[PDB]
Structures are given as C-alpha cells and as structure tokens.
Amino acid sequence: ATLKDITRRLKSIKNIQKITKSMKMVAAAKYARAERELKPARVYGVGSLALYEKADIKTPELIIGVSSDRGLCGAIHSSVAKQMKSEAANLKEVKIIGVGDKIRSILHRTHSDQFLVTFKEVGRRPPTFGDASVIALELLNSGYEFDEGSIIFNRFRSVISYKTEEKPIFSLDTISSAESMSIYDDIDADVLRNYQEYSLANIIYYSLKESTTSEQSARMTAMDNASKNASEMIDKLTLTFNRTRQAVITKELIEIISGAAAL
C-alpha cells in the first residue's frame, strides 16, 4: 500500500461509482417506458396465442433467441442462450435465428455454421411492431419451410425478477391443418397463409416487448448494485488512505526523532 497506489484506485472507483450510477438512471427511464408499453403489448400477446392454447396443436415427424445488444444487464442474454443450447443438442433439424448481437457472440463459436439470420441495434430504440415485421419478412423470404419452431425470451415479472420462457410457434402452414382444426369451419387453405403470417409477427413483437422490459429492469438493478458496491468501496479505501497518510507522517517523524536522539 502506497499513497501513489491508494489514490489511483480512489480516482478510478469514484469514476465507476458515477459511471454506473448514470447507467442505472439511463436504464431506469428505459424501464419505466418499457413497463407502460408492455401493458397493452401483453394483452396483444394474450389475444395472439388465444387459439393455440384453446385448441391443441402438435406436429408429426426453428429456434429463435430474443434479447438485445447492450450487455451488463446481469443475466438476460445468458439465460436464453442456456435454453437455446439446451435444445441445440436435444433435437431433428435445428436452425437458429438470433435477434440481438449478444446472441451472435455468446452462442456463436459453438453453433457457427447453424446460423440463418442475425439482427443488430436491438435494445437501442424501444422495439416496435415494425421491427417485428422485419423479423417476420426475413423469415418467410428465406428458403427454409420450417416444420415447427420455438421462441425463447425473457418474460417480465417485476423490477428484479424475470423468467426465461419458451413458446412453441406452429407456423408451418402444413401443420396449420390438424385434427383439432376440424372443429373449425369456413376457412381457406390460403387464408391461413395470411393469418399464420400475422400471428407470427404478433408473438415476435410480444417476446420483443417482454425482453426489452426485462432487460432494462435488471440493468437498472445490476448498475444500482454496482454503483453502490463502488459507493461502499470508496468509503472503505478512503479511510484506509487516512490510516496510511497519518501513519506515513508519524513514521517519517519517528525516523527523524530516532536519529536525533542518538547523537
């Protein structure tokens, strides 16, 4: 421990304490907006799936990861990547789509050749149905007529709690017509080709609206922890400095007096 070293770490933790403090505030505004924009978007998602739950849909014989770009949000990108790699080995042909750069980097090296499309700038600007539609367009423009898929995302619960959730997407138009669909009448083969396409854009948007609410909340959290872990570390080293300042003055003085009291 030295006066040069001590103050260097005090100079830099008073940085982190503040840098982290504003990153809590930045995320705190983005949470409060994402919490309001989720309130309707939930009802929207509720009404979107209210058909696949009321009438059972199976498949006789596509993985979508939803997170963001900006990290430091605790364990948002890492919780969905765990449940993606869980199904990457458990299954059958598996083709992956990752929304948010932090899926192209966290679970890439392992499944580098199993990529279909990648999406950036997620979590910078609050998501829209317009963003979900670009996700819907690119999926249907690719020559991958998928049998069945599942979308994995972070569902919001509260300021601190969230859970990684799967939702199966029966978006194969060949799978749209099952024995449970025989209950329904007055349908076209190519009117489901319209409905299935749109109900896909809904659930993508819903998962995206849940994610950016669950993401900014735990970044607000992680940074409120980190800024007040630095607040504690400042208050700890500062009085460690005083110890070492007073002791250096005292010790430099004994060193003189000892030399004066020998002549």
Next chain:
Amino acid sequence: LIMELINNVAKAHGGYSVFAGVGERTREGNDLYHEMIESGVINLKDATSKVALVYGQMNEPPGARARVALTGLTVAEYFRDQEGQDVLLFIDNIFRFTQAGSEVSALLGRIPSAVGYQPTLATDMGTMQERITTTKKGSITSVQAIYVPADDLTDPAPATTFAHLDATTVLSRAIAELGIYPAVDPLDSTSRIMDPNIVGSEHYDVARGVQKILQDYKSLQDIIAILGMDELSEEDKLTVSRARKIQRFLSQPFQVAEVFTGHLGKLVPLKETIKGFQQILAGEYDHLPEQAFYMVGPIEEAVAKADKLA
C-alpha cells in the same frame, strides 16, 4: 452569518460577542473590519458596538497565534462573570490554533506525537475549551470555524476538536447557488441537543419531520428527473411539493444585510419557527405557491407575500 449572530444575540438576549481571529490574513482583517462598521455592529462614533475584535495575524510568531484565542476568551469572560451576559465567542480558525500550538511544542523541543501534532494536544485543547461553558453568573457560547486537513475527519486536529463540539453549521456552495440564504445545509448540520429531553417534545418531532421530508425529496430526485413527474402517487406528488416549500422557508433575510439587499431584516422567535414549519408539514399551506415562502420572516409574511397581485 457571523455578524447577524452578533446582532441577534445582542438583540434577543442582550449579550455581547467577541471575535478572536487566529491566523487572520491582514487583507481579510481589514476587509472584515469595514464590513462590520458598514453593517452596524461596530460603531466608530458612539458606544453602541456589540463586538470586541482580537487579531492574531499570520505574520506574527507561533506564540502570538497560540495565545490570541485566550486573549479573545478573556475579553469574553468579563462579559460572562462581571455583567452576567450570554456571551458569544467566534474563533476563526480553530485549526490554525492547533497548528499554532504544534509549532510552539515543536519549538520548545518536545518530541512530536501522532501525525506530527504536539504531545500536549489533548490538554492544549482542554485548558481552553473548558473555559467556554455556562456558569452561575452567565455563559459563553462559542462558534468555531474549522479547517479539516486532507478532508480527513480522523486527523487528530478535527478529532480532538469534535470531542468538544455540541453542534455544527455547514455553509455550502450547493445551497448558496440555489439561492437559499443563509447557505446552511439542513441535513448536514447536526446537534447534540436534538433530543426530546432537552429542547422539548414538539421541537423534536417538527425538526425530524423537516429532516425526513427533505431526505425523501432527495430520495425521489432520481425518480423525478428520469421517470415522469406526473407518475408519482398522490402521497409522492404531495410530499415533493410540500418539501420544496420547506427549504424555501429555511430562507431568511438578514438585518446586517440591509445596506446590500435593500430588503427588511428579520428575527424569527423560537416558537414562531417551530409552528411555522409544523403547519407546512401538516399541509395547512398546500394551496400556497412556492415563491411565497422564499426570503421571509415568520409564516405570516409568507401568506401575505403569496397574495402579491394574483
């Protein structure tokens, strides 16, 4: 703040004051001299003066700087015992009194104690600070300006001084830049007599209520700047608007500063303050505007100001 304190003790309690400048810069000595005449406390003509000035300047040897705090205390001691007053004693600054005494002990040839200070530090402080108390005849109450070295509160100088300190008055830039005068930090200044047993049952709960309502204001500051003002609950919207009216009522115009400000000076009696703040906390003035409580005496002058024109 010093001069107003001199005025208001002489006014309210009929007690004189003594300024003992330990390590006074001669420029600041001259500047403080005319500031006291220009405001009213020193009267170069008649006998209406309220202060005795003692100057231990910097360009004087450690002996003079170490003993002037006594030369001031002794002039103040006359007005305690001989005229039975509630005296006021200013020391500015107390650290330069400690450093004065360290130099002396260093000069005589005494082996230095911790952090370079004198071995006699405890007593060097005790033999002076124990003359400043309430006697049977009168009392001397001392305001001491403190310099903390390396902003280190554990440094023996402020550490030895704090053992004798009953209350603090923090004059802050932050509060002064907002416009609140005197520039006192309401949460940063603390007192030993903040006890229901000493001041009273009412005084305590009203002070603490004001203390809590300002902390809550700080506690909601980040929620104010980054969430949306109109999304606080009824009880959170209310305490914010009530809290702003509290820190404005702390503001007070000063008599001493009539020559500068041009506005009338105020001496707010004790119970006027207690009930004044109690009513704002109870919400009795939830309808009045913010600018109403700014730079006013009692609560009466605040409601009258609230009228203005519209």
Next chain:
Amino acid sequence: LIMELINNVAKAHGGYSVFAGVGERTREGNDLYHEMIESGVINLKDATSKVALVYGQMNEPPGARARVALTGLTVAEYFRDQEGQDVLLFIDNIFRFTQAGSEVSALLGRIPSAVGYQPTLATDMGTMQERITTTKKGSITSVQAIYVPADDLTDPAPATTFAHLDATTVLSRAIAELGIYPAVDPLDSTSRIMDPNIVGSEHYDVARGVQKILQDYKSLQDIIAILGMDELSEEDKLTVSRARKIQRFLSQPFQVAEVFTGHLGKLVPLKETIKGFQQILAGEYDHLPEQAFYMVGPIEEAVAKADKLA
C-alpha cells in the same frame, strides 16, 4: 483454538505436558485450572498429575512477563532431556515476551528500532525460542499462540516469529467476521511437512487442489465485488460455487466452542477429511447447497444437513 487443541491432543497423550501462560488474562488461568482438575489431567488427591502450569499474566510487570516464558520452557526442557520423553509445550501468549521487552528496552538505555521496538528483538527471541525444540534425547511439540497488534502481520513481532516455526496456522479477522470458525486463512497458513514424500501424494494433491480453487476464487473476488456473480463466465461460475462450499466445509464446530455456539463439537479423522474435500473437488456435490457444508464434522453430515432442508 489452543484450548480445543489441548482437549484433542494433550488429554489423549502418554507423556507429560507443560502450559505457560504468558501475559494473557488471569481468569484464563482460573478457567484452565478448574477445567483441568475436572478432567483429571490435574489430580489434587494423589499425584497422577500430567500437566505442569506456569503463569505470568497481564497483571505482572514487564520484567516478569519478559522471563515467564523462559520459566515454562525450562520446566519443559527437563522432561525432554533428563527423562527423554514426548513433552507437549503450550504457550499463550508468546507476543507478551517481546512486548514486555519493548516495555523495558527504552529504560535499559537502548535506542528504539522499528515501530519503537527493542533493537535486540532479533536475538532476544532467537536464544529463547531455539531452546523450545525437539532434540536427539527427547521431543517437544510446541503450540504457541501469537498475538498480532493492529492486525499488522508486518509488525516486527509477529513477522520475526514465522522464522522460528514448522507449522504456521494464521487466523484472520475477515474470515472470523464471515462467521467461519476456526477462522484459519487457508492460503496464508503453511506447514514444512506439506511434501508428498511425508503426508502422501494423495493428501498433497487434495491440499494443492483446494488451494488452487481458493486462489482462483480470491482472484475473481475483485470483479464480483463490483459486478456481482451474474456477470461471470459459465466455467468460472462453477469454481466459485465449489470454492464457497469448500470455504464452509473448512469451518468446524469445536468441542470448546459448544458452550456458546450451541453445536455439538466434532473431531474429523484424516481419511474422512481427505476423502471429504476430494468429493467436493470432484464435483459429486455440485447439487447440495452451500450452507449444508457450514459447521459440520465429516462429509457424511453435509449430506444429512442437505436432507434436513425440505
């Protein structure tokens, strides 16, 4: 710890034992004496007495505390040479020997060394400590508790004491304040015996593995200190989780600790300790919670402890 160790080794010992109280509390003798009479190791009726006691507690003047360690070790010297047996020597506290020296060195007419100690600290300790040893005529197992002043392990007193030792067991406040007992730092403690050629390569490889997993956890502790555990890699997340389980499995309920920590005291056989920490290292228990390893004897009690939490 030194009392637990007596209860463990001194009681179940064939040869004789010498206890030397040096500059600690007087009641700490009145505790040991009455506890020892009770256990039979001291017999008052006859002379089957096994332990010899010598005292010079912190009530005694420097001179007495300076030489009382010598008194005890001389009693131990005899049982080693003149009878040639297995003597157990216990000393608490060995620091009070150099402290007492510190107290007189000034007056003896020395010039003060580092920290104002006796310049003769180096050799004062040497000539006295080198006697407390195993010879070719007999053997002394010497347990000496060492007071560290101001938790400063660099203070000339505890730092010179290392050089005289075969096994150093370092107790740390940080560890203690984490409710880990015995509060033994598992990375600062060393034994000259830790050599596969003695303890066995199986013992050595579990000790080196536990130390590696703990050094790695400690080096990640500055990143988790700001970020929190959430931010670690999936490889490191495991090492943290094991090291923490190990940390608590290094804690243990002592038999002398009973009469205030409510838990039944435990002694763990060496095969159970090695096999214990091997299994945690091997990943067999990555499913058990951390607190299941907290304050338990053998590893089979962690399994029992985990089942309780239903």
Next chain:
Amino acid sequence: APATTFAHLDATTVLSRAIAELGIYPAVDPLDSTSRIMDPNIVGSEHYDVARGVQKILQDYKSLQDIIAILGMDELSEEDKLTVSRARKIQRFLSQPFQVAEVFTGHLGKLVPLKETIKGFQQILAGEYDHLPEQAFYMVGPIEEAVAKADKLAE
C-alpha cells in the same frame, strides 16, 4: 534525492517498472518525460503536434483502462474503442530493439532516423494501420517493418 534532481535538467527521461513489466523496452514513460526543446519554434510544428497527439491518445487510454477493465469493451462507441486499439499500437511501436540489448531482446538492434519516427506515429494516429494487429508493432525499427512483421505473423 531524485525529486530534487528534477530541477537541474534540460530534458528528463523517466522509466517505469510497470512499463518494463509488460515487456515494453525501453520502458520510457510517455506522460512523464519532459524536454526544454519541445517547442515548435525549435523542432517544427509538425514534430510538436504529432508528439502532443501521440501522448493525448495514450493519456486518453489510461483514463479508459479502469473503466473497461470492469465494464467490458462493448460499451465504447466506434470512435472510442478505435482509440483503444490505436493507443496499444502506439504504445507498442514505442518499443524499440536496441543494438546494445541484443543479448536480451533476441533481435538485431535498430536505429531509426528522425523523420522516419515522425512519419511512423503520424500514420497510426491517422488510423492508416488500423487493419494490422498490435503484435506487428511490438519491437520493430522503422514503420515499414511493422508492416513486414504483420505479413510474417500472418502466414
């Protein structure tokens, strides 16, 4: 003793153990070395502005070091982390295989002319070498060699 010596000099060259620790030899501190002749009226305004610019980007990186060490690299924008990769290349191009240190370095000693040095750092600051890795710059003579070492370090 060394602190009093400072006031006796025209140009001071300060060495750090922390700089030498990273294998950077010579271990001259770019923020601690001061010359009397570091005046553009003597060395030229091109020489001056390049050097001032060299230090600024290393100075800026030093301020970032503790922020990025805990809070990752991604949180720097495309114009911030561009300076980080530059500063580390400027840091490493400052390293020089001495002709005396042949026994230590393991390289042939190099002697770089004045104008070859100013052109060197000028280009890296301009960002003309942003494509090349840092290790290309570590322990070389003139700047052409930093390109040469990249090509060899390729395949």
Next chain:
Amino acid sequence: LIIYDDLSKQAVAYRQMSLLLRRPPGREAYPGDVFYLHSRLLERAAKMNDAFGGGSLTALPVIETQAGDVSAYIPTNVISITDGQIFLETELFYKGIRPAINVGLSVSRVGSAAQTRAMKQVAGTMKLELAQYREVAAFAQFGSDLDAATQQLLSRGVRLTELL
C-alpha cells in the same frame, strides 16, 4: 461496578506523559506500555471465589474508534484485555436503531453462564432467528417478489429488530 469513560482519552493523556518524558514513540506515537496501562487495570475487575468472600468487580471500559477502525492499535489492545465487546456502528445509530449494537460483532465470552434461564428460553431462539435474518437480507426492496420460506425471515427480523 466500575465504568471507565474512557480509556482512549486516558491513553492520549499517558502518551503525553511518555512523550514529554522522552520515552520512545512507537505505534501511533504510543509508548511501549499502553497495553500494560490497560492490562493491570482491567485485571483488577474479578469474581472472587466463596473462600475469598464472594465479592465481584465488574468492568465496563469505553473506547472511541475513528470511523469504525477496530484494527487500530489501542482498540485491538482492549479487545485483547476484555472478556468481550459491544460494537456501536454509526451506520445503525444515524439510522434510528438505538441502542446501536452490532449483533454480528458483539460477543460476551464469560457472561453466558451468568444469564437468567427465563432469558435463555427466549434469547436463544432470538439469536438464532436474528442471524437467520442477518443471513444477507440487504436486498430489501421487493415487497412480495421473493420466495416463500425466506420471506418470513425478513418479516421476523425487522420486528425482532424494532423490539430491541
């Protein structure tokens, strides 16, 4: 019962004496026998056996730390003299908790077998549940967003805290 308020101020007094006497300034300028100063005094608090009359001197010495620094020279000494400590954190006092006793640091060594049994019947499972609450409950703000078996320990704690 004797109460020494306080030894830290008596220490500086004796340090003044030692330094005026020109005795070697050591740790924090304190003389070599500031341990002894408080050793010989606090030993004199004792509980005599019946043969000696069954009289007891009980000591409560006071120590003023600087900013919570228990590792300091003088405080560590008195920790090593006394049969136990009571810590008073500024962070609990300037919070409203009075008496501001740090429960996680204060221990009374030889004082357990001098407690009322009626107290042991209530304080035993109080000390147990207070450590179960102090088992990291700093998280605080979530209301009803946590578990089930751990939310009641937060409930118990604050009440068992307010009671004190």
Next chain:
Amino acid sequence: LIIYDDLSKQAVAYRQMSLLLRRPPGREAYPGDVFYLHSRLLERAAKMNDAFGGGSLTALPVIETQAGDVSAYIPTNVISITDGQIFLETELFYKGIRPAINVGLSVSRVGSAAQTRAMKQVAGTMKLELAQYREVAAFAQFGSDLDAATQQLLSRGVRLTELL
C-alpha cells in the same frame, strides 16, 4: 508584481540551517517557524489606501507538490497563508487542457471584485456552466439516451473548455 519561484525551495534552504543549527525538527524535518517564515513574507503584499499613496504590491508564490499532494506540510502552510490558489494537474496537461488549470479546485477569494465589470458579465455564467458540465463530464460519450438538457450542458462545457 512579485513571483517567488519557488517557496518550496526556500523552505528546503531554511530547513538545512535549522537542522544544522540544531533546532528541533517537526513534520518532514521542518522547524516550528517555517509557517512563520512564509506568513511574514506574503502578508507584506498589500493594497494601500489613498492615505498612504494608494500603491500596491501583488504576490505570486509557486509551490511544487509531489504526486499532487497538496496536503504536504509546506503546501498546507502556503494554501492557508494566501488569498487563493491555481491548481495545475498532469492529467489536464497531457489530455490537452493547457494551461492545465483545474477549474474545480482552483479558487480566489478576491475573485469577483478584482475582475473588470466587462469580465464579470460573462465569468459567473461560465463558472456556473462549467460546474454543471463537470458533474456530467464522465458520460460525454456514454450518453446516447440522455435528455436534451444535460446533452446541452455537455456540449456547452466541452466548447468553453476549448476556449480557455
């Protein structure tokens, strides 16, 4: 106008003599009257009234600090001695800000009343604006999602800093 360059070096030159005349040593081996050495030197600077001719002497002491430590004995002396300070820092220097005057710490007591009524008109505004800038200065790049208010206060500050 006088410039003592520098007083840290006179303090060394004085110290030598005292130590060798065998006067008692204090903090950093400085005698008791080294504060008194500089206090009588720097008070000698003053502004006389028209009663005494109205002339003035103006003082500018230089103090060299090591590792920025302004709490060293001699600097602590001169800081209190004088009416104000200008703090120059190594960081500000190489970062580019030259003269490397730390706007934060640097202070003058005479200040406002010393500058012309023209300067007053734009100085206090700059004092307030750089104050609000330095509070947010750390987020000059890491603030894409900041409000347009602090985003103005950052843009206002960086540009004033270039002007100085």
Next chain:
Amino acid sequence: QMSFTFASPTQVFFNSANVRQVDVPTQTGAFGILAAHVPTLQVLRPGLVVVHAEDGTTSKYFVSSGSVTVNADSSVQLLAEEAVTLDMLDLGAAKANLEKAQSELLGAADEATRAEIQIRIEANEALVKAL
C-alpha cells in the same frame, strides 16, 4: 355472453369485455359475429369495426390491417397493426394521399410495385367510407 378482446400494439381497448355482437371488415367482405358464433378464422381488411356494447349505444373504430378470431367457446379477440378511433383522423389529407396513390399506379409497371401502390389506394379509399 362472450368475452371480447380488442387491441393494437400501442393501445388496448377491450379485455374480456361483455359484448353481444361485433362487425369486422375481413377479406371475405364484412362478417358479423354474434354471442354463440361458429369457429371461423378470418384476416382483416382496411375498413370499419362495429362493436355492439351492452347498453344500446355502439362505439365504432377504423382499422388498417390485422386479425380476428372466433373460437369453440364463446370468446372473441380482434387485433390490428394500427387501429385508430374515428375521432383523430383527418378527412382532408386522406384524399391527398388517394389522388397521389392513383397517380403512381399508371406510372409503375413492375409487378412488385403495382401491388404496393394499389394497397395504399385500397387503404385511402377506405378512409372516406367513414369520414
């Protein structure tokens, strides 16, 4: 009784609300769904939405595009990309767009561009069916 759910990505209107009948502008004209209506899925078309409330007075809305759903039990849900009330749409700018849309129709031959302009015609031509 039937639970009715109507919302957009931005705003929510009904959530399991008690309503008797709803009229919806589907592809296949405009379908009317009563309390115990048949299981029939049909996608949306730019037009008018009639929601028959429980107390005599009906609220009506305008839709861009989306989906409606009627199920094996008495429960209905309707969703649109952008749905706005009759209150906030200008009748002025709607003709400005329509006339501009019918200009690009004869000025584009690409089979991909033709569809894109005609959909905008259809949407703007539906903006006068209400205003």
